[PDB]
Symmetry: D2
Subunit: 242 residues, 4 copies
């Protein structure tokens, strides 16, 4: 997270951290609990090449990374078949936990938006995670969960901005229909935040609008962060999670 602040212990109960096995169980991406038994993440975090299930762990909300670890096993990794890279799209994936989670005031699911949600500029939206604080800048220890309120920019506008300073033809889409943009040069997502959520407060209720996906750097001029648009994959999500 570039900008923002440490989340209060009371915010973002659905946030999780993905851990890969090695010298220690290192965090590599974020995610969200969208069902007692399913975590929503970004496909690039776990693909496109097939990974070893035994080398992965899910960690639920934690105010400080690694300090109160209760690693959970995963029985399935479901990656969207249309995925190869985040620029092409379909950067979305599911982790079915070996066991369901006992919900809490501190840890519970996040609501997926209705299929018609669009999230126009102006909506209060926050992206959260334990990722870098700036290009090539690691989140220092104790690794507090960070949050930052980011502005949503219309797709067609964001697309045109990505073409700024590039050789790419104005009529060839960079920011696709299944993607969403948010952030400016002071507020953004960054490596390590990938797979986590972008949530907006809609009608007195938090809705997960996107999944941290990619972008040209973090907080750079004319390069807002790109998120996998949740609405574009509800059909797919629902094939697996109740």
């Amino acid at each position: 997270i570039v900008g923002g602040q440490e989340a209060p212990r009371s915010k973002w109960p659905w946030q999780v951290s993905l851990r890969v096995h090695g010298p220690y169980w290192m965090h590599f991406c974020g995610g969200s609990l969208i069902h007692p038994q399913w975590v929503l993440t970004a496909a690039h975090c776990v693909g496109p090449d097939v990974k070893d299930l035994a080398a992965l762990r899910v960690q639920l909300r934690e105010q400080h990374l690694y300090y109160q670890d209760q690693l959970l096993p995963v029985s399935r990794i479901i990656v969207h078949p249309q995925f190869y890279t985040a620029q092409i799209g379909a950067d979305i994936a599911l982790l079915e936990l070996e066991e369901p989670v006992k919900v809490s005031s501190h840890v519970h699911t996040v609501t997926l938006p209705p299929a018609s949600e669009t999230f126009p500029p102006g909506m209060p939206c926050w992206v959260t995670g334990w990722g870098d604080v700036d290009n090539d800048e690691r989140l220092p220890p104790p690794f507090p969960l960070k949050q930052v309120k980011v502005p949503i920019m219309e797709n067609h506008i964001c697309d045109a901005k990505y073409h700024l300073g590039a050789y790419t033809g104005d009529d060839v889409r960079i920011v696709r229909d299944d993607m969403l943009c948010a952030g400016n040069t002071r507020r953004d997502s960054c490596q390590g935040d990938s797979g986590g959520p972008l949530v907006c407060k809609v009608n007195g209720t938090w809705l997960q609008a996107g999944v941290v996906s990619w972008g040209e750097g973090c907080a750079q001029p004319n390069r807002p962060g790109i998120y996998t648009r949740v609405t574009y994959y509800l059909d797919w999500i629902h094939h697996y999670v109740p």
Copy 2:
């Protein structure tokens, strides 16, 4: 260049090296002289973001990099408008030299192929360059030009090979129509070879069948090197090169 060998001084008179301004004039991509005044290269070497002509220089066929440089200014950098990433394709570009090269026996153009040339499996082709001798293994000094013969593989088979060990849907194209595959786990192009030439001897003439573009690692199982298919872009090339 993975495997293969240092190239005889009389072979590959069209090879060029692209240099960026810095502590010194560092090699960052290969190229190929296709007209006394034009260099063919890979778009990802100079894009998708536009860079400053002043930071770029072109070095003609040299046996040992940096050994006896004779840098040449560039007047125009022309990138195919359909380019954004190598996985998406259209990874091709043209560099206009401020001045037309005096062709000799040691340095001259390579022939472009006719739109019909498919270059099927079994054709003798060589990739040349000064890139890494293996994944994360730099070409050691005195940095000699390397060559390695590579077996070509039909697009459809190469594409399916790339699905082996991957979550990508079998019906989702990974290797595209504007690309060409060649190489194995012991002979391949690699980082730093990008933008250079893949030439096949066709009925008496060396023709440039491809532009080194990308792949998953170098000489990795089921991951041959991917090249931009020169025939596909012949129309685009001729719109600028006489």
Copy 3:
């Protein structure tokens, strides 16, 4: 600390962490409370060149680094004058806290030995710290205070081992007289543990035998860890600590 285990919360009440300001108050060396107002560390940790006092802070016994920091200012940095490098000797320094520690049952001073104390082989000695767990292997998060029981070795047997595989003359002393040896290829202190304590239980009492100084790598064959002999520098210490 190489080998050993995370230390229970009750043991090592004297352990302290030294911190330098940067993105965060990063730990860089060990240290030990020898008086409510004085911390004993290694000269190499804070020397030989003069450093800005506003750049240093001290942390008393903390189970996991960074977790619950209570950073303490420092008034004075006293380095043995005969110190230049650890191989030469006199790797010992004193830190004067801005004010006395409210000594408690959990965090309190360690006892310095008598000048006559020798701490001979087969003795029960221990080293504690937050340093690397192996050569080029940082203590993983959440960084718990580690401890390891190490076997003391006579200074001359140690010097002999250090000459094995080296050009240095047999008659030339590597392990000097103001130094002490402990450890093997399975247990040893390492970078990050410098300045920390080596304590030995003598007739029902814990006595600080040395301060982590140097060695060739950590837990390497024929290369026991080398400590600054505290008995050697008592007059200097007493000259400052009441």
Copy 4:
């Protein structure tokens, strides 16, 4: 070499490059030919631990490193028995080439000073080598041999300068009697240059005053380069070298 410039081809016939075996015969230290069959160098380049002779190669004078190699095998490595670290002293060594060198104009020996030579405060002395052009800054390719003229600084004046801004006692010498100082904040030797010669022209004859050995950084305020005083080790050298 910090500051200075490339050496004309005619100068420094005695300079040599020491190579270690790896992906390629990598340069690691400089050296000087003092006998058709003997090379003078620093002991820290090849010690304190004993090295594998099959892994070492010597390269006589080269305008450009690696471009026209002709590696010569070594039959013996003589490290001064008093050596352990460069701050302690005796940073000198001898390599005996397997075969006597065919001496000429382009490449021949350097003259060692008489037992009493002194080299007074501020003399035209030169240091040469293929090392870093600055702290953490490498010699870019094609790695031309650099030269730079450096002022001598009497040892007492130098030692005092090393004490400025340092804790070490004024009566404890850092710059030792078997050492010599040269250089300033704009001209100096650096990592990679170690083992190479420092020559001072006295009465038409170029004499080697020292061996590049150590210092605090390169060309740092109040920290001139430190060299092993040749005159101090003449007897030891002649015990081996005719």
